[PDB]
Design a protein that fits this description.
The PDB classes it as lipid binding protein. By secondary structure, the chain is mainly β. The chain is 0% helix and 52% strand. The strands form two sheets. Strands 1, 3, 5, 6, 8 and 9 form a six-stranded mixed beta sheet that branches. The chain binds 2-acetamido-2-deoxy-beta-D-glucopyranose.
Length: 130
């Protein structure tokens, strides 16, 4: 479902929608061993041959890297090369892992371009359930 989020630095892209499922109301919650489906609609303001995603869980203000199944944006629903003013749908999953403490965690998701600049950066709170 479309979720409310905080933009943490979208620089060469413009976010149109952050859709995380299951998340009808917030904070999203999901148990360890299950994965969220993520679909980010954004419009690029630059051309780029490549794109790379990176996710962090900010736990009590401390960032921790959060692995995803595929980090190449061009293999995540985006047909590269990325073009200026074109709209894309970045799609991936976020597994909730046993290593994550079962408390509120802020998830930060980013996608960068050839120049390592942020197409998008957004944050949302999630509750990790054991
Ligand atoms: C991603 O969201 C768009 C709506 O912006 C929809 O057309 C598309 O099917 C969704 N993609 C998948 C793979 O979830």
């Amino acid at each position: 479902e479309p979720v409310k989020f905080k933009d943490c630095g979208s620089w060469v892209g413009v976010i149109k929608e952050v859709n995380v499922s299951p998340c009808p109301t917030q904070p999203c919650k999901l148990h360890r061993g299950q994965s969220y489906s993520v679909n980010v609609t954004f419009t690029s303001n630059t051309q780029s041959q490549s794109s790379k995603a990176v996710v962090h869980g900010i736990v009590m203000g401390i960032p921790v890297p959060f692995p995803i199944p595929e980090s190449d944006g061009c293999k995540s629903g985006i047909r590269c090369p990325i073009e200026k003013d074109k709209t894309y749908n970045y799609v991936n999953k976020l597994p909730v892992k046993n290593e994550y403490p079962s408390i509120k965690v802020v998830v930060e998701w980013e996608l960068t371009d050839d120049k390592n600049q942020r197409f998008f950066c957004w944050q949302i709170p999630i509750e990790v359930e054991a």
